[PDB]
Amino acid sequence: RIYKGVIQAIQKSDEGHPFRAYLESEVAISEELVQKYSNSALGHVNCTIKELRRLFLVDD
């Protein structure tokens, strides 16, 4: 069920338009926030950052 949505996604943005980059950037930049949750978890901060980045993840 659309499990390979990594090579296709990067493709679309590559097909649709280049301007998408600057867009996907903010999306890929957020992917890091999810990584900060691990270091933020130190004090349930992940839910604080996630809620800021994702706005739903809230830790997980």
Rounded distance, CA 51 to CA 13, Å?
Answer: 26
Experimentally, how was this structure solved?
NMR
CB 58 within 8 Å of CB 50: yes
Structural domains of the chain sorted by starting position, each given as residue range(s) with its CATH number in brackets: 7-60 (1.20.5.2480)
Strand, helix or coil at 57? coil
CB 57 within 8 Å of CB 35: no
- Inter-helix orientation angle 9-16/20-40, to 10°: 150
Instruction: Give the DSSP letter string of 1-19.
Output: ----TTTTHHHHHHHH-TT
Strand, helix or coil at 40? helix
